[PDB]
Design a protein around this ligand. Structure first.
Ligand SMILES: CC(=O)NC1CCN(Cc2ccccc2)CC1
Length: 123
């Protein structure tokens, strides 16, 4: 129907917005600590600690399959990346500190993304 099409146009423009956001978020991770899933070969007991792993590559796959219906779902995954890291890694590690910096810098991007989502009405 025309309705389904209109909906899909909105999802596509949401996806376009979120792709930009993801690219900006990933720029705040120059070391690329969060670029890929934690390796179960290098950390074989990771899943004993973290029940819902997340990383930027995994987000990008969901993103490109238009799997984020709204900004909230996207933010959920971004928060997983940060929160998983700050539990698994101790406070005085380069890993924990990278997540803190990513959280803080990312918040600026996500704050304006929320306004753009609401203003354009993409949800
Ligand atoms: C996102 C996140 O938490 N990434 C990593 C942080 C620390 N590394 C340490 C490490 C390196 C090499 C072998 C075994 C463990 C494991 C996972």
């Amino acid at each position: 129907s025309m309705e389904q099409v209109a909906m899909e146009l909105r999802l596509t423009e949401l996806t376009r917005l979120l792709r930009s956001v993801l690219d900006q978020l990933q720029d705040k991770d120059p070391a690329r600590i969060f670029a890929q899933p934690v390796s179960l070969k290098e950390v074989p007991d990771y899943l004993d600690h973290i029940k819902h792993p997340m990383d930027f590559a995994t987000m990008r796959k969901r993103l490109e399959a238009q799997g984020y219906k709204n900004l909230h779902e996207f933010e959920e995954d971004f928060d997983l990346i940060i929160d998983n890291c700050m539990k698994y890694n101790a406070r005085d590690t380069v890993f924990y500190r990278a997540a803190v910096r990513l959280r803080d810098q990312g918040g600026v991007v996500l704050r304006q993304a929320r306004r753009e989502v609401d203003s354009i009405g993409l949800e």
